[PDB]
């Protein structure tokens, strides 16, 4: 999990805004963010297709029933 | 035949207690005639329940 | 939803007829169901008030 850093000894910063800001959010903010990421997380079409097959299976019966007129 | 789907749309789908038979309820017969004409929507059975409830409401009017 | 309901044919609803599919579509956002009593201007003003 923890990164492998090339420079062994760590270094302070003057915290310029022209310097890119450095990951200042502590671990409770990351706990809140993992809670936010946890909380923020067809066949019916072919069913209707075959049901239209059933409707035309009724419709051929209506076709047979209407030829005597 | 017809009896298995009628006992579905009375007991399995509609969840009716069986002592409300056919002979106690004529508009139930007028509704099961068209309930059996479709095959979907048997998961949301509460729509069918409140449909027959509004039907027995509108039949039991003096007007 | 995504398109506005300018085709007027997705606005219909009947009462007392046992319209079973619209009762199963009570959560369907796209079909609209109105009771065909269009509001005139003065009761629109009173409702806005």
């Amino acid at each position: 999990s923890l990164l492998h850093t090339f420079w062994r000894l760590p270094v302070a910063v003057f915290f310029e805004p022209h310097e890119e800001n450095v990951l200042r959010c502590p671990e409770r903010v990351l706990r809140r963010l993992l809670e936010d990421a946890a909380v923020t997380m067809d066949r019916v079409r072919k069913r209707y297709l075959r049901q239209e097959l059933r409707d035309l299976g009724h419709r051929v019966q209506t076709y047979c029933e209407d030829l005597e007129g | 035949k017809r009896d298995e789907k009628h006992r579905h749309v009375v007991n399995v789908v509609l969840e009716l207690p069986t002592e409300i038979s056919e002979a106690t309820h004529p508009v139930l017969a007028t509704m099961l005639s068209k309930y059996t004409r479709m095959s979907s929507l048997f998961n949301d059975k509460c729509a069918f329940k409140l449909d027959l409830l509004r039907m027995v409401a509108v039949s039991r009017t003096r007007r | 939803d995504r398109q506005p309901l300018n085709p007027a044919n997705i606005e219909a609803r009947h009462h007392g007829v046992s319209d079973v599919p619209r009762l199963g579509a009570m959560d369907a956002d796209e079909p609209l169901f109105v009771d065909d009593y269009r509001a005139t201007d003065d009761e629109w003003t009173l409702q806005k008030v």
Binding site: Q51, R59, T62, D66 | M38, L41 | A25
Partner: peptide, 20 residues
């Protein structure tokens, strides 16, 4: 006589509202 075509016209929008 002519009632059955109108009943078919009712059932296809019935199937539409079942579908869409």
């Amino acid at each position: 006589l002519r009632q059955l075509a109108q009943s078919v016209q009712d059932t296809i929008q019935h199937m539409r509202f079942l579908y869409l």
